């Protein structure tokens, strides 16, 4: 009796990998040991580490310009390691669209990274992508591809002669993307592609260049972790041993496009059903920029239902649905593993609960 | 058909903590989700990550002169968040006793500190711990505590008013401890405390004065996350479940006094098997400083023995045993989840090989 799960992170995992995870846990095929159980310096665990790497990158269809780094410490981690590693004498411009391109912003600035905000939608409480416009000639440009907290998306990323870098934490493994003039592309695992403790890194090996030249701790520098294999120091097994379940688990079903329409339909009509409510539910977000990863949205006449709508849905088998606190109201998370029969569910519980309280 | 895994990590857990997370791993405690799934900031979660926090607290018998903090990245990254947070405008004494200390006496330079390296066993091959004086007014003195690769380790901690520092990594609650002055005791966690990708810091509080000052990233400043309760971004959920299935099994057993001794009659039934060989097996460490966790040896009049020893332990149901490459030979970790009949029936191999190879 699993319950429809809409958290934003840790987030809900594909059943089927969880039953294989599971059966074999103390067992991990045959071998008498758990995955969780042995060196990372193994011809096993290598297959894994190995195969991982290699299906996200056909995933995306990358190239060999691209390194694939499994590092821990989440994304938080790469707000820093980011300018540490790929900042030089110049500017580093970013595009402030949420919560987290603040905190990108205030760690390269930390760091003392010369940091300009090419643009920014904070006056308007996060509620669109500006118009962004990059230089030809800085350092890098960062961007985060979804905004989590928020529920807006870029449907275009930004064209630029400068390094792209994108956050695509939560977006990640979720449509084709265009790399043309992507630097740097990663994301926190544990929305879209597995459990929290491991990030994926995409880099460019230009990037890795950069890293060569600079004088910083081992563990802190891409460089490093790019010649050892992401093996400098013990990674998280267990994690990469999820994710290659998850890569496995995304090409089974077709690859990005596949999975991009899947997405699409859910999130269609999870936001049909907030436009066809009468009013009844509002979206925080700019239609032109919703995402199709976390629906933000409110109870328009009356706040005080908020809570009394969270509680319900808990009742009616339905999880991790509370906005986040900076934004209060209603927030419905249908990544990957959601279907689109639970985002039917929630619609149908939308229109009874709307029956019930308008 | 569970192996005899001596790996020396990540490593072998007791198969009870094992069993419950596979059992629950769909649906934790019967509420329909996986521990894997859920937010760290939810009172589940926090039930669980607190209370891992207090029974450390417990097993080493500490006050709140300490707060216990939980990171990612390994013991590796702590070889540079040390300096970075607890370094001063003084000298950074360490005890120089294996590739760890090595490594961390690395990191600690490139980040321009002023690394003393007052004792060194490496004339020698780290075949024992040397004479340890640290000076009483320096900003931090730093000890490994058990050196994995050559198998040693410290009987006694040295003596000082310097603030000091401990990897306590490879022997983390194997044994009670006085904290009389330790400033810093920590461990990456797949040794003794559960699964890689998460560390546990002991922290006593002063030390935290010293990162208040400090101007770097947030993800690597100790106060930062004392003041956040080792939840300033999303830990590694699972880990720490982990780990707390680990505490309460320590606790079960009678606590560390009665885990020690149990390690004590294991080490002391191995080394007696290396003693009692008539020169066949012999061991890398000075008998002074044996360690009781990693018990490194070689087949001294024929080194080619040693892959077959391997090989043939193997098939005898037996594996992790091929020693690191910088010493060749032989490695039996014999860490807490370890039993004495599993000590037995490597002796007994012992025994066997040398009376087909002698």
């Given at each position: 009796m699993r319950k429809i799960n809409f958290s934003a992170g840790p987030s809900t995992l594909p059943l089927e990998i969880l039953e294989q995870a599971q059966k074999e846990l103390c067992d991990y095929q045959g071998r008498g040991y758990s995955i969780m159980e042995i060196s990372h310096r193994t011809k096993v665990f290598e297959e894994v580490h190995f195969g991982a790497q290699e299906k996200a990158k056909k995933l995306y269809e990358l190239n060999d310009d691209y390194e694939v780094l499994f590092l821990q410490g989440g994304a938080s981690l790469q707000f820093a390691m980011i300018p540490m590693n790929l900042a030089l004498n110049g500017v580093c411009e970013y595009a402030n669209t949420g919560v987290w391109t603040k905190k990108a912003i205030k760690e390269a600035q930390i760091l003392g990274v010369n940091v300009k905000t090419v643009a920014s939608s904070e006056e308007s409480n996060f509620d669109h992508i500006p118009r962004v416009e990059f230089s030809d000639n800085a350092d890098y440009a960062y961007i985060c591809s979804n905004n989590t907290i928020y529920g807006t998306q870029y449907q275009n990323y930004p064209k630029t002669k400068t390094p792209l870098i994108v956050?695509?934490?939560?977006?990640?493994?979720?449509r084709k993307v265009d790399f043309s003039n992507i630097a740097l592309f990663y994301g926190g695992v544990q929305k879209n592609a597995g459990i929290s403790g491991l990030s994926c890194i995409f880099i460019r090996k230009d990037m890795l260049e950069r890293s060569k030249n600079k004088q910083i701790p081992s563990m802190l520098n891409y460089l490093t972790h790019a010649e050892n294999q992401s093996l400098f120091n013990t990674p998280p097994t267990f994690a990469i041993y999820m994710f290659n379940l998850e890569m496995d688990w995304l090409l089974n079903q077709g690859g990005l496009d596949k999975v991009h329409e899947k997405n699409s339909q859910k999130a269609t009509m999870l936001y049909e059903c907030i436009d066809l409510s009468n009013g009844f539910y509002k979206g925080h977000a700019d239609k032109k920029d919703r995402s199709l990863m976390n629906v933000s949205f409110n109870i328009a006449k009356n706040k005080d239902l908020e809570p009394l709508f969270v509680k319900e849905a808990e009742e009616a088998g339905m999880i991790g649905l509370k906005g986040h606190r900076i934004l209060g109201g209603i927030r419905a998370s249908i990544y990957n593993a959601l279907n689109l029969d639970q985002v039917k569910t929630l619609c149908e519980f939308m229109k009874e609960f709307q029956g019930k309280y308008a």
């Open positions: 956050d695509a934490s939560s977006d990640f493994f979720s």
